[PDB]
Amino acid sequence: GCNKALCASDVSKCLIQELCQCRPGCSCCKECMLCLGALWDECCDCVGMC
Amino acid sequence: GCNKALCASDVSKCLIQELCQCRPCSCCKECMLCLGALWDECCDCVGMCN
Amino acid sequence: ARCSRKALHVNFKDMGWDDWIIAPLEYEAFHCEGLCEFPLRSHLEPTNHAVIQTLMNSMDPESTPPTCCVPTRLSPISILFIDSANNVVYKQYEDMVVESCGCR
Amino acid sequence: KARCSRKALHVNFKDMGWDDWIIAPLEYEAFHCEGLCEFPLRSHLEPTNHAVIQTLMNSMDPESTPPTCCVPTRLSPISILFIDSANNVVYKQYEDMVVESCGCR
Ligand SMILES: [Ca+2]
Ligand SMILES: [Ca+2]
Ligand SMILES: [Ca+2]
């Protein structure tokens, strides 16, 4: 579900910004989607937020 | 040189004891005490041969 | 398969330390081993440098090597031994047991 | 194959596809750690007691115990001017961006 070739750049962009680092057990679940933008559908599985 | 087969056990003994970790010198003598008879054959492993 | 903590049994006699360590004769230290590929999970609490290196390694592995799975948290154990001066010592040694692994 | 040491690593942001949100700098030297981690471990770098013991076991039987690994032990930051997810312009200092020293762990 995580296309590594398609999501490597943008997913890493949001990580170094300290986003997509919370766990759904949720606070950053929404700020993470904002950072990925159109790639949320194709890359949400890379961070387990869907 | 440093004989790894002959010095591995005893040299490591002195490292975890927080000895032989200074550079040339303060701990040069407490290190020699820990190696004992193996000082000649293992001083190069910690660069304390002077 | 990915970076994780695995078992590692330490036997002091096997290492030739039975001549100065009195007790314990063995303990579990564990070790870190596994792959460090994109994505690096936050369970790896990665440095911003590790994140970038993993990305470059994923783009062109021929040019950039991956990060490595190493211990990120360690706890101590107490040991009763004989020092180089023949004194008997009961000391707590730090960074002896692995508690968590991460890619760095 | 040299021992654990700090080696060059040039980071180009446009090459990584980050030129659309990072304004400056577009590139910087981040370095990386790579090399052999076998006995003896450089004792002046103060390796953890666990790394010391594992290295010993690896020296006793490398077939049964794997060696420690060469990773960064001290990282420094750099400042970056970028556009955050909210289209705000931000000048922030990013931590753990440049490697200053390597060590076996
Ligand atoms: Ca001798
Ligand atoms: Ca012995
Ligand atoms: Ca882009």
Residue numbers in the entry:
A (entry chain C): 25 to 49, 53 to 77
B (entry chain D): 25 to 48, 53 to 78
C (entry chain B): 398 to 501
D (entry chain A): 397 to 501
What sentences appear in the manuscript?
The TWSG1 N-terminal domain occupies the BMP type 1 receptor binding site on BMPs, whereas the C-terminal domain binds to a Chordin family member.
Serendipitously, the TWSG1–GDF5 complex crystallized in the presence of CaCl2, and we identified a calcium-binding site that mediated TWSG1–GDF5 interactions at the periphery of the binding interface. We confirmed the identity of the calcium ions by anomalous difference Fourier analysis. The calcium ion is coordinated by 8 oxygen atoms with an average distance of 2.55 Å: carboxyl group of GDF5 Asp416, main-chain carbonyl oxygen of GDF5 Gly413 and 5 water molecules. 2 out of 5 water molecules bridge the calcium ion to the carboxyl group of TWSG1 Asp34. Since the calcium-binding residues in BMP ligands are conserved, and calcium is ubiquitously present in the extracellular space, our TWSG1–GDF5 structure brings this ion into focus.
